[PDB]
Amino acid sequence: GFGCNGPWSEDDMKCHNHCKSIKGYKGGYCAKGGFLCKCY
Amino acid sequence: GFGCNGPWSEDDMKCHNHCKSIKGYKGGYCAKGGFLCKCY
Amino acid sequence: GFGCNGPWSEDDMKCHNHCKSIKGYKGGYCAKGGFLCKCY
Amino acid sequence: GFGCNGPWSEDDMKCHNHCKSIKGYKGGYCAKGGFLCKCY
Amino acid sequence: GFGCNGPWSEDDMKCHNHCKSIKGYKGGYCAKGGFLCKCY
Amino acid sequence: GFGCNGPWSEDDMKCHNHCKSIKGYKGGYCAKGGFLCKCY
Amino acid sequence: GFGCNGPWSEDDMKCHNHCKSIKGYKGGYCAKGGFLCKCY
Amino acid sequence: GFGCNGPWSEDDMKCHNHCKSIKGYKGGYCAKGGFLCKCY
Amino acid sequence: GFGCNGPWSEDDMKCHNHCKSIKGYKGGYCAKGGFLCKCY
Amino acid sequence: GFGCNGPWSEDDMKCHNHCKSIKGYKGGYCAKGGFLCKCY
Amino acid sequence: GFGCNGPWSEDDMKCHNHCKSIKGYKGGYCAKGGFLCKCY
Amino acid sequence: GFGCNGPWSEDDMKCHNHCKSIKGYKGGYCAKGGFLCKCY
Amino acid sequence: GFGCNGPWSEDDMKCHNHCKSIKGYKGGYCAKGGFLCKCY
Amino acid sequence: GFGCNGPWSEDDMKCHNHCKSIKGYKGGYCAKGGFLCKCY
Amino acid sequence: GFGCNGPWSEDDMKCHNHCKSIKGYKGGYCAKGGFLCKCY
Amino acid sequence: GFGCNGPWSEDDMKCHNHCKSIKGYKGGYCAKGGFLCKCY
Amino acid sequence: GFGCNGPWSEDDMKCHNHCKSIKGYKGGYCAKGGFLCKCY
Amino acid sequence: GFGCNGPWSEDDMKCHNHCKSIKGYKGGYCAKGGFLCKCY
Amino acid sequence: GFGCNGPWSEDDMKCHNHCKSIKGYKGGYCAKGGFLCKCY
Amino acid sequence: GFGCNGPWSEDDMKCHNHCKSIKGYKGGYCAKGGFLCKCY
Amino acid sequence: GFGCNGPWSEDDMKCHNHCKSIKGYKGGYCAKGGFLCKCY
Amino acid sequence: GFGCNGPWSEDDMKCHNHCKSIKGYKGGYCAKGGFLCKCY
Amino acid sequence: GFGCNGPWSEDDMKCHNHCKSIKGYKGGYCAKGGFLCKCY
Amino acid sequence: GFGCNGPWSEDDMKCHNHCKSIKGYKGGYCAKGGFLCKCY
Amino acid sequence: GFGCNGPWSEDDMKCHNHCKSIKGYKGGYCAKGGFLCKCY
């Protein structure tokens, strides 16, 4: 979810913004080859 | 199922929430290129 | 069949349940881009 | 034909059964986005 | 024409048979979402 | 809208032209698997 | 409803406008393969 | 547009031919997971 | 084109065979993540 | 081809089995990042 | 985001240009194996 | 095969378990940069 | 496995923690150039 | 960019040619493990 | 882990900083040829 | 280029053969840790 | 760190320049066989 | 080539066996720090 | 070979054990600066 | 072995401790220019 | 730096030429066991 | 050990300091041609 | 340079041959403990 | 230490200068056959 | 050359045998402190 949907993803930052909603995380990215919102 | 339906999927967390319904799993994602609810 | 009908599919588990009807298979999913009930 | 008629298709296996009528094919599915009986 | 008439189509192969009437084509299907006899 | 209507869409550029009607956008396309006019 | 009626839909924005009638939503589209007014 | 319509696309080269209509481009392809005519 | 259509591609060798139609090329494959017939 | 189709590939050994069909090759794999049947 | 989308990325410099938008950074690249816009 | 599918691989031990099925081998790993089940 | 997946690995300690599950081993690392969980 | 895209890179010399476009540089290569066009 | 990931490592000091988290250690480095966070 | 692409390189001699195309050079190799065709 | 990364290091002086940032040190080098920024 | 590929090399003796294919040479090894098949 | 692979070697005794497989030799070591299994 | 690995050796006493495991030997050192565990 | 990079160094004279850039020095060499450009 | 590592040794006094840790010894040095910490 | 590279040197006579290129010198050798081409 | 490192020593006077740092000593030299800084 | 390579030399008689290849010489040895094949 959060937009991590492979080639059909769109740069909506939903993964990034959602990850930003958690303390200790300054961003997120589509891991698992573009299919998981992984927060860091 | 559980919303893992490729480009026609919608961020309903149905995969994630369904995976959450099992002990030992803190989330889920659309593996198999967005076509399988894989729990982790 | 078994519900693997692209965007018009509904999460009826018919693919999954049908795949469950075979020994050695613990689930199924809509492969071929959501148009084939592939059992695993 | 053979039931591959998009959202108006019904799970009659007509595509699958028809494909089964040919040697070397163990099934069929509605390719072309649910509008062609493709045998495999 | 040739039977490609959406949900009111009937599996008369008229699209398929008509497409078969042309060299280089081994079949046909109701493209444009079930409303055009497309030959292949 | 704007023609993004899945397989029944027609190449009327209505999505593209409509997107062109907004500053900063040089085109548009049928995202959400062909069912949303997404402007870019 | 709201115009999400598959190939017989017309670009009346009824889905879009209806979705606009709810706070937090900047548009809507015909999900479920053109048969549900999904608001976003 | 230009035929980039996901699984319902047909190999009409409309994307490719349209891209060919621009200097500096020797072809085109359906990017965005088969839903955008991207010229190169 | 030539069958390079992501998950909805089918192993028709159309990319490969089409690439074979050019001197100096012994095959082809679906580059750009399965969305371009790249000849080699 | 031969199943080398990125994340949408399935472990059908089609690449491997196809490579096995050539003398001097004891297997094959999806090179080019999972998008080419490379025989060895 | 910013185009870092694995094999489906396109050389749009969106990662690079976006990274350029920050002082002290003269470029960017798709780290995490092509799935994160890392600025440098 | 056997799960050696680059970033889209999942830790199913299919490579490892498959390699275990051969005498003289105590494990396996995804060589060729994560795209070949190499047994050892 | 155990997370040793080259550039797509994530610092989940799965290799390390898994290695810790064996007596005589105080850690593990991704040998074979980041593609094997080697325990020490 | 410039083709430095890991395993999905193609030998288009785009990195090399782009680097050649700068005085004092006689070539370029995909540093950062194949993910950065580094000029030399 | 801790960033010791061969050529795909980035100078995040994660190895160094992590090693700093232990008494008696004034730094760390990527031993085992860049694939192990060794503390000193 | 010329096949010097780290772990995803294949023994195509493209580096070697390309280097052979220059007088005074009897071979080539993937320097820079497998990421540059260096001629000698 | 600081560029001391074995064969994948690049002559960026990051080790040297970083070492220069400390009083009493007129340079630095990649000790530990090219894997530690040692200041002198 | 011949397997001399740094940490991603595998003990396939391809360097050694290839060197054995030349008179006056009783073996070979991966010189240039594991990146050249040097025959002796 | 036989594990003599520079810094990426692991103490598998493969060089030593392999050397032990020859009469007159009571051990082996990684000569040529850790890149040749030399038997003694 | 036993840590005698040239410049990439680390002062783990593995050579020394291993040599200590034999009667008549009070230590060991990396002979052959740092590439052999010689016991004394 | 300046090419003094152990076994991965290449005879680019970068150490030598760089040392030549200073008055009183007629050459340079890779001291510290091939890991420091020492000028003389 | 203790830093007695031939040309790759660094003047860390580890040999000397370690030797100092024993009564009756006022220093140490790298005997065996720079490859053994000999205490005196 | 000229092959004087410690244990990783190879008997290429590059030091010797290079020294031969100067009048008054009948050979050369790797002085400075195998790390300088000294001509005589 | 202090530069007394056999053939790999360099005339840095580190032995001499270090010896000069002690009253009653007007110099130092590399005793023990070039492997000990002996002060006099 | 000819094996006169300091502590990393091996008793290959290459110096001796090479010296034997000249009339008036009954042997050779590694002069210059083990770094020159001197014939006598």
Residue numbers in the entry:
A (entry chain H), B (entry chain L), C (entry chain P), D (entry chain T), E (entry chain X), F (entry chain R), ...: 1 to 40
Question: Can you quote the paper on this entry?
Answer:
Plectasin consists of 40 amino acids and shows well-defined secondary structural elements in form of an α-helix (M13-S21) and an antiparallel β-sheet (G28-A31; V36-C39). The structure of plectasin is stabilized by three disulfide bridges (C4-C30; C15-C37; C19-C39), which is typical for this type of defensins and leads to high conformational stability. Plectasin contains a cysteine-stabilised α-helix-β-sheet structure, which remains intact upon fibril formation. We have determined the structure, kinetics, and functionality associated with the pH-responsive self-assembly of the enhanced plectasin variant PPI42 into helical protein fibrils.
In order to investigate whether there are structural rearrangements upon formation of the mature fibril, we analyzed the 3.4 Å resolution structure of PPI42 forming the single protofilament obtained by cryo-EM. The structure of the protofilament was determined using the structure of the mature fibril. PPI42 monomers show a very similar arrangement in the protofilament compared to the mature fibril (all-atom RMSD: 0.727 Å). These helical parameters are very close to the seven monomers of the asymmetric unit in the mature fibril (average axial rise of 3.75 ± 0.15 Å and an average twist of 156.48 ± 2.25° between two consecutive monomers, see above). We observed frayed fibril termini and a small number of single protofilaments (black arrows), suggesting that the protofilaments formed first and then assembled into the mature fibrils.
